[PDB]
């Protein structure tokens, strides 16, 4: 399957460069249908990636600690800062309701 989802510009570059190897998202209805082998089209075609793995957590904090913040949000020095990044996109109620998913990705040329 091929899935479409938005992605901020700064992350598009980090993924292409091989620094950002994980895409964190709310494990919501849309994300609950993704499996390794699928393809994700980011920000209207600015980047295409292959899904290599799916790991679900109860929170962004736990996801970041297990996946390694440098592999998810390159440059962010602390887990607290990492959680803040996600809070700008996802509220705590949604996080508690759906859980969080770490999508292992590989850029497609």
Experiment used for this model: X-ray
CATH class of the domain whose range is 1-109? mainly beta
Q: Quick check: 49 and 15 in contact, CB under 8 A?
A: yes
Structure tokens at 48: 């295409």
How is the chain split into domains, by residue range? 1-109
Structure tokens at 75: 């440059």
Q: Helices 60-67 and 79-87: crossing angle, nearest 10°? A: 130
């Amino acid at each position: 399957m091929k899935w479409e989802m938005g992605l901020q510009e700064e992350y598009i570059e980090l993924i292409k460069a091989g620094k950002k190897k994980i895409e964190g998202r709310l494990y919501d209805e849309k994300r609950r249908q993704i499996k390794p082998g699928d393809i994700i089209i980011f920000e209207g075609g600015k980047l295409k990636v292959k899904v290599k793995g799916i790991r679900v957590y109860s929170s962004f904090k736990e996801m970041l600690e297990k996946e390694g913040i440098e592999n998810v949000l390159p440059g962010v020095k602390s887990i607290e800062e990492g959680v803040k990044v996600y809070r700008q996109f996802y509220d705590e109620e949604r996080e508690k309701k759906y859980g969080v998913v770490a999508i292992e990705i590989e850029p497609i040329e």
